[PDB]
Scaffold this active site. Structure first.
Site, PDB file in Angstrom:
ATOM      1  N   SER A 135       0.957  -1.221   0.405  1.00 32.41           N
ATOM      2  CA  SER A 135      -0.079  -0.437  -0.193  1.00 32.41           C
ATOM      3  C   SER A 135       0.679   0.779  -0.043  1.00 32.41           C
ATOM      4  O   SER A 135       1.755   1.269   0.663  1.00 32.41           O
ATOM      5  CB  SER A 135      -0.924  -0.174   1.425  1.00 32.41           C
ATOM      6  OG  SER A 135      -0.318   0.216   2.460  1.00 32.41           O
ATOM      7  N   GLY A 140       3.665   3.228   6.484  1.00 33.56           N
ATOM      8  CA  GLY A 140       4.678   3.585   6.257  1.00 33.56           C
ATOM      9  C   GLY A 140       5.625   2.590   6.182  1.00 33.56           C
ATOM     10  O   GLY A 140       6.884   2.673   5.195  1.00 33.56           O
ATOM     11  N   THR A 141       5.283   1.427   6.694  1.00 39.36           N
ATOM     12  CA  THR A 141       6.449   0.124   6.254  1.00 39.36           C
ATOM     13  C   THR A 141       5.931   0.053   4.451  1.00 39.36           C
ATOM     14  O   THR A 141       7.039  -0.361   3.562  1.00 39.36           O
ATOM     15  CB  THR A 141       5.989  -1.353   6.437  1.00 39.36           C
ATOM     16  OG1 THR A 141       6.516  -2.023   6.237  1.00 39.36           O
ATOM     17  CG2 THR A 141       4.750  -1.166   6.892  1.00 39.36           C
ATOM     18  N   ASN A 192      -8.969   1.673  -2.743  1.00 42.22           N
ATOM     19  CA  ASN A 192      -9.912   1.253  -2.069  1.00 42.22           C
ATOM     20  C   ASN A 192     -11.650   1.845  -2.680  1.00 42.22           C
ATOM     21  O   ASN A 192     -12.552   0.976  -2.443  1.00 42.22           O
ATOM     22  CB  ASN A 192      -9.650   1.116  -0.499  1.00 42.22           C
ATOM     23  CG  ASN A 192      -8.716   0.234  -0.534  1.00 42.22           C
ATOM     24  OD1 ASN A 192      -8.267   0.877   1.078  1.00 42.22           O
ATOM     25  ND2 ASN A 192      -8.540  -0.475  -0.979  1.00 42.22           N
ATOM     26  N   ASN A 251      -9.998  -7.945   0.324  1.00 44.98           N
ATOM     27  CA  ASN A 251      -9.374  -8.452  -0.102  1.00 44.98           C
ATOM     28  C   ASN A 251     -10.206  -9.716  -0.957  1.00 44.98           C
ATOM     29  O   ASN A 251      -9.091 -10.611  -1.041  1.00 44.98           O
ATOM     30  CB  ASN A 251      -9.268  -8.906   1.585  1.00 44.98           C
ATOM     31  CG  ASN A 251      -8.387  -7.718   1.794  1.00 44.98           C
ATOM     32  OD1 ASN A 251      -8.166  -6.754   1.464  1.00 44.98           O
ATOM     33  ND2 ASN A 251      -7.831  -7.988   3.190  1.00 44.98           N
ATOM     34  N   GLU A 272       5.004 -12.919 -20.303  1.00 41.94           N
ATOM     35  CA  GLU A 272       4.435 -12.023 -21.477  1.00 41.94           C
ATOM     36  C   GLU A 272       4.005 -10.819 -21.052  1.00 41.94           C
ATOM     37  O   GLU A 272       3.266  -9.979 -21.008  1.00 41.94           O
ATOM     38  CB  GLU A 272       3.749 -13.082 -21.565  1.00 41.94           C
ATOM     39  CG  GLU A 272       4.205 -13.851 -22.857  1.00 41.94           C
ATOM     40  CD  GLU A 272       4.938 -13.291 -24.140  1.00 41.94           C
ATOM     41  OE1 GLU A 272       4.507 -12.997 -25.147  1.00 41.94           O
ATOM     42  OE2 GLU A 272       6.068 -13.585 -24.469  1.00 41.94           O
TER      43      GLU A 272
END
Ligand SMILES: Nc1nc2c(ncn2[C@@H]2O[C@H](COP(=O)(O)OP(=O)(O)OP(=O)(O)O)[C@@H](O)[C@H]2O)c(=O)[nH]1
Ligand SMILES: Nc1nc2c(ncn2[C@@H]2O[C@H](COP(=O)(O)OP(=O)(O)O)[C@@H](O)[C@H]2O)c(=O)[nH]1
Ligand SMILES: Nc1nc2c(ncn2[C@@H]2O[C@H](COP(=O)(O)OP(=O)(O)O)[C@@H](O)[C@H]2O)c(=O)[nH]1
Ligand SMILES: [Mg+2]
EC number: 3.6.5.-
Lengths: 53, 408, 428, 63, 428
Positions: B132, B136-137, B198, B220, B241
């Site tokens: 995402s 932060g991560t 989203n 999800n 491809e």
């Protein structure tokens, strides 16, 4: 007064349990040669008021 | 011999991979314990001599409280206990914390477990990175991961599934700084980044399905359906491809995504779902997975993945623009899921000129903040110089003129 | 593994903390002895954020209870939950501050910080990864304000990269009960601007306002105003202990509402506060939480956010709710109000959703708003500080402790400039 | 035939989804009742004076 | 999908609009505690027009009760259906208006107007698509008319695209229970001109003619007059709540009867009003509903349309009935009469059919008419304003509240032009 109210609710619960014990015993009492076997309108449907186990 | 190593970075990555791996367990015979009660699972699973099947995935977070639920949930016995990697303190919506200070404590561990996973596979197609942009991560450690994977794993395919920031709703203030400072450093290090946001999936789950007030799980599961339709020709076209037939120029690797029948079981009874119907419904702007409109741009490429049984105007230099692949296994319904049971489906991945407005809005909001130098002290104090804002902004200026230049 | 050390000073900070710990212990199923009596597994899973395990299954809080008189350490010890506190953590002196800032900062409190810093260095070594500290204190007193802002200045030189929240009870001009209130409040706001990371401002005339017109209590005591504060104090740490769909650390809230390093004075609020007569009318949904969260009848500070722009806004939800409905109400409150929100910040509201509601509720929420209407709070103090000090009304108490007159001049222009700092974003 | 059994499966799934929706609405009303009953029984809104009772004895109170 | 936010102002405004809710709640099957006990689903499918949801299957109205003294907000609460209202929406001041139009417009009702526009925005921004508000008030009192025009003057500016209906009780020509009546009504009709989409005119004298001569009651009361108002309030807004063969919203009547924007004063009526004894002879067909809308004794205003011309006519029919037989009678009255209809509109009647009838009736009917005989009302208010104002009788009770004498002189000439406006659509 509170004991009277609790007895009221327990009496209603006993009433419900006896009547469905009657219905369940009749459903077990049916067999392969009862004259009230009648291929009903809609099995496998769930009524509007339906709780879970 | 047709494996796909999956990497799930961030809370978005872990909570998407939960739905993906539930679907992958149920498509084959795999119980959540790990035993089957045929070898087509070999693209996603590994067969231990003790009968157990272990997935080819690495779950990464800098916070432990979204992987601890995987460790104590229903799928506790399925995962290898050190394929789930956790830190102690998170990145806190900070690209600098997620790139320089905190992510350097975990980058070597993630590369070690990735090397251990890639040594099992004989023929490895490529990696899939789920992340995402806003977090932060998922914005810092993901870009650090692609930077340290490009030099280590060759010219392998590095596909990305990203949550691009939505045009009017977001769950953060400091999101555009992340969303530009990650694109500037993943522009040259990626092959194909399918972007879904989203807000469009909220629109589809409100409109196509009748789910008013959905949560993240209903999103999800649809993402899991798209990933299965992408990889299904390996199990029942390739990953290789896609980068040839979707990315003409080496900076324009940003295609889109659509799944054609997303309908409920009380309206699958009312209608045909023939190939013409689902093909027409791919190209409709109400059914795209980014709140944008390809009428107001120009199409550049399209890949159509069928599974089971003068308004569209192209660019000057690409007249054909079509790749078609066909698979035979119909999609699999999960219990508790909301889609119907259907015999046919289409997934279209389309590269278009009509994504220029997204980068124009992102640059506008970055300019709106950064001209008055708001929030800059957090990013400067965590081991990151100030000038990177200037280089990221002039680089994305070059990217907008690129999107205009190719269209002209 | 993100532990929080609680520090609490004064009579005000010890009577807030006796009710905050009475709320957390219910939330985790701890009886007044200390033994876990609960009916889940989520409660025992991350109890180490606030509680230290003892031998025999007991849990004791990670709190330090300081004061300068021994009189408020006995009513805390004689409450319902007073026997869970570790008896070494009570640090109390035998001569009071006497509503004096200088005795709290130089004479009495300076002989006690070295006997408190020994204690907090013992609960900073039981944590595998310490998140940060917390202080609850009153700015209108003498040992909440002298010793309390003496501890923060000595904590922040020894743990300089941590997080240091405060919950300041700023004095009110109407509900005021000390003549020498604005001397201590001026000389402590000077001490909070360069030594805290977040500072939630609380006025006691805004907690009485909520307890009179919303909860409709007949006689609100202080025990019913400490329950209002302690419901927000556990609403900002609720994703560190319970899982969710979109978490929030205390660090993550520092990132998103501090655009410039001297702008960190907030105004808390708590969403489902209702009467006992209006309980069957309330419909219990997420738009009803959002309408009350943003209400200007509801903030725990005595300044109205209709007098200024909203710089940034938070929201920390609890319960099982829908991420579409949470995210569409923050957009909805932001587009009608064109000039209640600052122009150079395009998205101002940060949202987080925890999954476990408070004990006895279905869902809840919390608000941490950063406004440029907080600078009227520092001008009612600065119009009463300068009314007294222009004739030196009460200074001989303060000068005769080793304190100079020049500190009453440097703590005027150092708060006269923060009002002008919040003013320059009030209008572009 | 295969279209027939797919349509029958879709109809059956619509019935179970509707029943799941009805069940979760009734559980929500149950949680609303628990909400209001616990909040009326709570001592903050009841204002019972017993919360002033102190562990030291029945003669002293909590200030 | 089409919500209506009810407002009501004053002792007249609350004793009318507490009987209107008992009318509506038994039109939809709602018991006195608020729950639903009915035997249809047309009673429930369009109930969101007026009722906010509460918890446990309980419905609360969208009504806000404003007043300037707390004595008439406890007779409302202690009636039969008084427990259905949310208690926050009760708004009352502490000192009365005192039948003083200035006191409620400038002095007492200018601090209460800020406290009710918090209430009316929480109920307006919680609708999916707001159709339009209402009001119920009297132009003789002080808080119905002084503050009650300050509301319309303010919330037209904030919401200028919605609908603002009012149900005035303008002062009676014969009976007058207040000497200072004509200063109230003259200063209030100017505020109705600019800020209101529709306005009905109800005279309490012409309600007394119905309840004695036609309904034939021994003792009428102010519940047998508040039943006549509420049975016209329900008729205008029943194609919003119940399906029909031909529909009519609140807009579709204002589109047709208001040609020019200054001319929105109407004349209600109601057809089947019959006695006990005469019921055996009466109550027959649809020609006995068009016979008694248009009867000039049944008008709810004490001004007779024989003196002038119907600019536009309206009719809302209730009951399941024939789309032919409705349309043949309106053709029958438009053709027999010539000089009761304006020349430049050749189809002056609009019709509507609603299926679900009123309570206890098998069919019913409702009327709205628009006349240039409504401008005999203002020539009788202005004959008793400038009678008093010539020799300056009660002037100190208004000038000492903060007014001036040329606010009076403009407000008569803001009525002596609408009189001479209607006199030029008198003859082409
Ligand atoms: N579609 C989808 N999006 C998710 C999900 N979970 C989180 N997100 C997205 O995640 C974004 C918030 O950032 P996160 O990914 O949660 O945070 P992070 O990457 O872990 O970064 P840190 O919090 O600093 O550790 C939101 O914008 C959501 O759109 C999910 O389960 N499904
Ligand atoms: N909100 C709140 N305020 C309190 C409480 N106890 C005392 N106060 C306020 O604290 C102020 C006095 O602070 P105090 O603790 O006496 O400062 P000290 O003399 O230095 O200890 C007064 O304004 C009290 O109203 C409490 O439990 N809650
Ligand atoms: N229709 C009706 N008219 C009323 C009622 N009560 C008073 N009035 C009339 O309203 C006028 C008085 O207005 P009132 O409401 O008493 O003044 P307010 O309370 O200050 O708004 C007088 O002309 C009364 O005749 C009532 O219950 N119904
Ligand atoms: Mg995270």
């Amino acid at each position: 007064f509170l004991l009277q109210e609790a007895r009221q609710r327990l009496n209603s619960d006993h009433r419900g349990k006896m009547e469905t014990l009657d219905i369940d015993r009749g459903c077990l009492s049916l067999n392969l040669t009862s004259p009230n076997i009648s291929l009903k309108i809609n099995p496998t449907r769930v009524p509007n008021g339906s709780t879970s186990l | 011999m047709r494996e796909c190593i999956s990497v799930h970075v961030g809370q978005a990555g872990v909570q998407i991979g939960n739905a993906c791996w539930e679907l992958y367990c149920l498509e084959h015979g795999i119980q959540p314990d790990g035993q089957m009660p045929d070898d087509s699972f070999n693209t996603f699973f590994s067969e231990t001599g003790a009968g157990k099947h272990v997935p080819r995935a690495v779950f990464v977070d800098l916070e432990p409280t979204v992987i601890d639920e995987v460790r104590t949930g229903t799928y506790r016995q399925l995962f290898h206990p050190e394929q789930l990697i956790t830190g102690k303190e998170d990145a806190a919506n900070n690209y600098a914390r997620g790139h320089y200070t905190i992510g350097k404590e975990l980058i070597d561990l993630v590369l070690d477990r990735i090397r251990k996973l890639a040594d099992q596979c004989t023929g490895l197609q490529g990696f899939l990175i789920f992340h995402s942009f806003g977090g932060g991560t998922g914005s810092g450690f993901t870009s650090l991961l692609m930077e340290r994977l490009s030099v280590d794993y060759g010219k392998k395919s590095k596909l990305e599934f990203s949550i691009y920031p939505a045009p009017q709703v977001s769950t953060a203030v400091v999101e555009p700084y992340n969303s530009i400072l990650t694109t500037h450093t993943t522009l040259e290090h990626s092959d194909c980044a399918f972007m879904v946001d989203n807000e469009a999936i909220y629109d589809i789950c409100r409109r196509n399905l009748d789910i008013e007030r959905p949560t993240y799980t209903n999103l999800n599961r649809l993402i899991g359906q798209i990933v299965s339709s992408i990889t299904a020709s390996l199990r029942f076209v390739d990953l290789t491809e896609f980068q040839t037939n979707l990315v003409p120029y080496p900076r324009i690797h940003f295609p889109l995504a659509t799944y054609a029948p997303v309908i409920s079981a009380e309206k699958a009874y009312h209608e045909q779902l023939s190939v013409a119907e689902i093909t027409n419904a791919c190209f409709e702007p109400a059914n795209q997975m980014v709140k944008c409109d390809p009428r107001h741009g120009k199409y550049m490429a399209c890949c159509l993945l069928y599974r089971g049984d003068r308004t569209i105007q192209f660019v000057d230099w690409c007249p054909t623009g079509f790749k078609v692949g066909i698979n035979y296994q119909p999609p699999t319904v999960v219990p508790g899921g909301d889609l119907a049971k259907v015999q046919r489906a289409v997934c279209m991945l389309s590269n278009t000129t009509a994504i220029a407005e997204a980068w124009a809005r992102l640059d506008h909001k970055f300019d709106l903040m950064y001209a008055k130098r708001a929030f800059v002290h957090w990013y400067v104090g965590e081991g990151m110089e100030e000038g990177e804002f200037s280089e990221a902004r002039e680089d994305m200026a070059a990217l907008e003129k690129d999107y205009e230049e190719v269209g002209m | 593994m993100r532990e929080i050390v609680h520090l609490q000073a004064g009579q005000c900070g010890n009577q807030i903390g006796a009710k905050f710990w009475e709320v957390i212990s219910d939330e985790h199923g701890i009886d007044p002895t200390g033994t876990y009596h609960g009916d889940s597994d989520l409660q025992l899973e991350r109890i180490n954020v606030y509680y230290n395990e003892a031998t025999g299954g007991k849990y004791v809080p990670r709190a330090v209870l300081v004061d300068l008189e021994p009189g408020t350490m006995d009513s805390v010890r004689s409450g319902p939950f007073g026997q869970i506190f570790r008896p070494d953590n009570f640090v109390f002196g035998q001569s009071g501050a006497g509503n004096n800032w200088a005795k709290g900062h130089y004479t009495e409190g300076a002989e006690l910080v070295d006997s408190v810093l020994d204690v907090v260095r013992k609960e900073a070594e039981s944590c595998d990864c310490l998140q940060g500290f917390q202080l609850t204190h009153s700015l209108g007193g003498g040992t909440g304000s002298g010793m309390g802002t003496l501890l923060i200045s000595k904590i922040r030189e020894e743990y300089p990269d941590r997080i240091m929240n405060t919950f300041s009870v700023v004095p009110s001009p109407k509900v005021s009960d000390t003549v020498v209130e604005p001397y201590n409040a001026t000389l402590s706001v000077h001490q909070l601007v360069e030594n805290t990371d977040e500072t939630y401002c609380i006025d006691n005339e805004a907690l009485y306002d909520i307890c009179f017109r919303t909860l409709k209590l007949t006689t609100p005591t202080y025990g019913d105003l400490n329950h209002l504060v302690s419901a927000t104090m556990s609403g900002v740490t609720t994703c560190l202990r319970f899982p969710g769909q979109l978490n929030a650390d205390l660090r993550k809230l520092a990132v998103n509402m501090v655009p410039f390093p001297r702008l960190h004075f907030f105004m808390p609020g708590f969403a489902p506060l209702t009467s006992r007569g209006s309980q069957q009318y309330r419909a219990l949904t997420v738009p009803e939480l959002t309408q009350q969260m943003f209400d200007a009848k509801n903030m725990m500070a005595a300044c109205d956010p209709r007098h200024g722009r909203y710089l940034t806004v938070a929201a920390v939800f609890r319960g099982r709710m829908s991420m579409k409905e949470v995210d569409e109400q923050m957009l909805n409150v932001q587009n009608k109000n064109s000039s209640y929100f600052v122009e150079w910040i395009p998205n101002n509201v940060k949202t987080a959703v925890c999954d476990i509601p408070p004990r006895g509720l279905k869902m809840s929420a919390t608000f941490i708003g950063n406004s440029t209407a907080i600078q009227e709070l520092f001008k009612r103090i600065s119009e009463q500080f300068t009314a007294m000090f222009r004739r030196k009304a009460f200074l001989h108490w303060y000068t005769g402790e080793g304190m100079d007159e020049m500190e009453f001049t440097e703590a005027e222009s150092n708060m006269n400039d923060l009002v002008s700092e919040y003013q320059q974003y009030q209008d572009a | 035939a295969v279209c027939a059994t797919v349509k029958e499966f879709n109809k059956n799934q619509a019935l179970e989804s509707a029943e799941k929706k009805i069940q979760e609405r009734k559980q929500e009303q149950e949680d609303n009742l628990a909400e209001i009953s616990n909040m009326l029984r709570g001592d903050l809104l009841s204002e019972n004076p017993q919360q002033a009772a102190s562990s030291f004895g029945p003669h002293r109170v909590v200030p």
